[PDB]
Structure formats: C-alpha cells, structure tokens
C-alpha cells in the first residue's frame, strides 16, 4: 500500500569524554537499509539491506560526502545551540534531525517532513505546506529567520517532492521481495492467574510485516479499553515484529472477552477468545 | 538517498 522513506540523524556532544558522536540511519517503511557511525572505523556510508548493495560507487561516495556534511553541520549546531541557551561547556547535549516523504498506494507524493530537535525537545520544524516553519521557542526564532533568508524551505521542498519520492520508488522496485511483502500475523492467547478472583488474558501477534497493527480487547461486544496494558510493537530481529495485549478479567468471566486484530496481511480482522 | 541541499547550521 502506502510507503515512506525517512532518515534519522543523532549528534551527541561528549565534553568530558572526547569528540562528538554522530549516528545516521535510513529507513524504507520499517526496514533500515543504510547507516553511518562516527565511532566506527570505515568512516563510510554502509549498507544494511541486500537490495541497496547494488548501488554503484557514485552512490556510496555521494552518500558518504553528504552524511559527513550532515555531521559537520550538526557539529556547528552543538556549539551554536549551547550559546543560544546559555549552557555550560561541561554538559552533554543532543541534536536530532528527521526528514523524509510519504507516498500512497500509487507511489505518488503524499507528505514531506523535516523536523529538528535539541535535547529531545522540538526546536524547528518544516510545516506541511513545505514553505514555512514552526519555531518551538524564542531561541529558535533566530534559526527561523536565518533559514528563511537562505531559502532552505525551497530546497527541502524540491527534495521532498522530487528526489525523496523518486529514490523511494527505486528502492521499492529493487527490493520488491523484501519491501512489498506482507507477512500475516501468527496469533495465540495465553492465560494465567493474577490474584484470587482475577486472571490474565494476553493476546499475541507474531511474525508480521509491516509493523503497523492494532490490537483491542472487547467485552461480549463492547469496546472495553483503557483498563488494559498495551505493549509497543517490538522487532523480532528477522525483519518481522511482535506485539501483545493483555486484559485483567475475573476468574469466571473469561469467555466473554474478545481480542480483535487487523493487519494488512489479513483479509478480515481476526477475533479470538480463550480456550 | 539523503539530502544534498537545504542543510544549514541553526
């Protein structure tokens, strides 16, 4: 169906330890395909998926120069942001950047992103129209005025509406066996006793791709939620994902609780009950 | 393919 490509950048200053660390990763949907680690020895953009290894040297030389340019830019931001917020030189601080594009089932442009954070808090973000900015605080207004004079939004828009979706369609074609697959979940239910007069009913979903899935619990027909524990979707290590949802029910009210799972690998939302 | 433009210091 709909797909996306995103790049995640993390820069951390380490005053009491040494030089800053820079980590960059690229994703197509929930599948990472490239990476760069400033602490690694290669100092190159490295493949992380089989379908990206076919790219020629001009790709790996070009991505490496650009990912180094990102790191060198974040290295300047660390000093600048430390001045913007009157912070000491002895503390460790984090710069994070995320950008990418979404496409629909027709692989055409849907939405572009470019978000920037400092110390885990929003700093400046490109608006949906790809022509204006949202400054989080008053110190970020300086950056907003600087990037508007540099016409940064026009350059990002040309990438998000053009280069981003063009390479995304190329990736989806080169890795059709991997990216365009849909692994159906493998569901089962577990049951244990919490205390007297109480029991646990856990609804499992294993080996499904993509990571998007919804698990809800229901009581003899009605949506009885917000009294339940929902664990976040976790990776299994082989390209698939896992997730579970457990509800607390009386020791005798067991067979009046349904769990409804729906995944794009399932033609119709599944339902299960204990036993 | 990552950005080759629009990356400016804050």
């Amino acid at each position: 169906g709909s797909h996306s490509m995103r790049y995640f950048f993390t820069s951390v200053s380490r005053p009491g330890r040494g030089e800053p660390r820079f980590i960059a990763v690229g994703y197509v949907d929930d599948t990472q395909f490239v990476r760069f680690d400033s602490d690694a020895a290669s100092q190159r953009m490295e493949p992380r998926a089989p379908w990206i290894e076919q790219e020629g040297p001009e790709y790996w030389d070009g991505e490496t120069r650009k990912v180094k340019a990102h790191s060198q830019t974040h290295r300047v931001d660390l000093g600048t942001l430390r001045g913007y917020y009157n912070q000491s030189e002895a503390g460790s601080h984090t710069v994070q950047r995320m950008y990418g594009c979404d496409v629909g089932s027709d692989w055409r442009f849907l939405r572009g992103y470019h978000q920037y954070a400092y110390d885990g808090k929003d700093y400046i973000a490109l608006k949906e129209d790809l022509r204006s900015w949202t400054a989080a605080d008053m110190a970020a207004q300086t950056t907003k005025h600087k990037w508007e004079a540099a016409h940064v939004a026009e350059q990002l828009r040309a990438y998000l509406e053009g280069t981003c979706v063009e390479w995304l369609r190329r990736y989806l074609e080169n890795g059709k066996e991997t990216l365009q697959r849909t692994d159906a979940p493998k569901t089962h239910m577990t049951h244990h006793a919490v205390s007297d007069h109480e029991a646990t009913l856990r609804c499992w979903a294993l080996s499904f791709y993509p990571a998007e899935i919804t698990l809800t619990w229901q009581r003899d027909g009605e949506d009885q939620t917000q009294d339940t524990e929902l664990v976040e979707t976790r990776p299994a290590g082989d390209g698939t994902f896992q997730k579970w949802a457990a509800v607390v029910v009386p020791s005798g009210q067991e067979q009046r609780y349904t769990c409804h799972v729906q995944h794009e690998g399932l033609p119709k939302p599944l339902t299960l009950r204990w036993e | 393919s990552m950005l080759g433009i629009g990356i400016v210091p804050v």
């Epitope: 040309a158 280069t163 | 080759g4």
Partner: T-cell receptor
Framework: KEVEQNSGPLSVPEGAIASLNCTYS??????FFWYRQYSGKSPELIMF????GDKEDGRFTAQLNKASQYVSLLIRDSQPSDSATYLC???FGGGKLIFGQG | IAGITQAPTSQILAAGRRMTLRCTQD?????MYWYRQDLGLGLRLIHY???????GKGEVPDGYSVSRANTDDFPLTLASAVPSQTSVYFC???????????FGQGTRLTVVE
C-alpha cells in the same frame, strides 16, 4: 566524463537560439548550475535548478531531466554580448561541485 | 559590500618555492572551494570545505593543501612549485554545500624554472 558539456566552439548567428547541453554521471545529483565566463574573467552564475522541468529567466531557459541525466540551457536572441564560455556545474554530494570543460 | 576576495591577483613563482593564495569572504558562507583552470580544459576542483574547521579533497588535490580555521578564510598552499601548477586559480564559496557558488576574481599563477 563525470560532467560532459557541448563540445565547441559553437558558432551562432546573431539573433539565433543558442542551445547548450550538459550530461552528468551521478544519478543522485540534486543541484545543477550554469555559469557564464568571459575571457579572462570570473564565472558568473546564470541560474540554478533543483527539480525536473524547465526554468526561465529572461532570454535564458534551463531544462533538467534527472532520468536522462542531462541539463540544458537555451539562449534566445543571441546578442554579441553573449559571446563567452558557458560552464556547467553539478554537485556530486557534499562539497564535490564539479564543472564540465565549458 | 559583502563578497569574496582573492589575493594576490598575479604571481610569478620560481620552481621549488612554496606559496599560499589567500581567499576570504564575509557573506557568512559555510562552504568554500578552490579550483584551477588551464587553457586546455575547464575548472577542476582542488579542495573543498563544507563548514568551518573541516576540509575535503577534490578532483586534483595532489600538490596542494588547504586549511579552514575560521568561516571567512580558506588559504590554498602549494608545497613545491612545479611548472605543471601554472594555471588560473579561482576561489569560491556557497551558503551551504549544494547551493550556488560565488567566485572570486581569480589568481594568474605562472611557475617558471
């Protein structure tokens, strides 16, 4: 080979449309530039382009097609002042801004 | 009044001597470039710099070296003058990597034996 331009010199009558083209090898290039350099002077920017399609600026029109990996420049109403060497510049990532032969 | 300036504008070097070409810009540009242009081809990238404090290698870095101690300056230094280094050297700068480059006046350098 990385950036190959129209091989000249091109003789164009006064008033004729002068067509210049430029091919590049890196399919991932994201910014493209046309410069004008008079004899013994510095390269002066004519226009830049980031996206596929046309871009017009007076008598100058640039055209980019990433699929064919070419960028072209058409000069209408060729004046005598247009007599110079026209340079094509393509960014190969980071600071690798490479020029053609002109 | 903000622009990019090269110095010197002309220089005649005896072979074997070292030489440094000056280049400075006050446009708050992060990226700077050095090119050489001979009467037989076009511009060839010698060295580049994306930000202050970093450098990179261009098309023909052999025989040259650069430093980027601050944002404004970007000197090009010749280790040992060779007649093959006789050319016209252009310094350029861009706001950031990938954007349009603004060139300096140029330096006519001739290395004679």
């Amino acid at each position: 080979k990385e950036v190959e331009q129209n091989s000249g010199p091109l003789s164009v009558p006064e008033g004729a449309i002068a067509s210049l083209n430029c091919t590049y090898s890196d399919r991932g290039s994201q910014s493209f530039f046309w410069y004008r350099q008079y004899s013994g002077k510095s390269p002066e920017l004519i226009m830049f382009i980031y996206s596929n399609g046309d871009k017009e600026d007076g008598r100058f029109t640039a055209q980019l097609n990433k699929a064919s990996q070419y960028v072209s420049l058409l000069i209408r109403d060729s004046q005598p002042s247009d007599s110079a060497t026209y340079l094509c510049a393509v960014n190969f990532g980071g600071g690798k801004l490479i020029f053609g032969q002109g | 009044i903000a622009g990019i300036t090269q110095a010197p504008t002309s220089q005649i070097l005896a072979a074997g001597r070292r030489m440094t070409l000056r280049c400075t810009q006050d446009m708050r540009h992060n990226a700077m470039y050095w090119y050489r242009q001979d009467l037989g081809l076009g511009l060839r990238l010698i060295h580049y710099s994306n930000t202050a404090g970093t450098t990179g290698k261009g098309e023909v870095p052999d025989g040259y070296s650069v430093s980027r101690a601050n944002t404004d300056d970007f000197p090009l230094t010749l280790a040992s003058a060779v007649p093959s280094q006789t050319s016209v050297y252009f310094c350029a700068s861009s706001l950031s990597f990938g954007t349009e480059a603004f060139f300096g006046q140029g330096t006519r350098l001739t290395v004679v034996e």
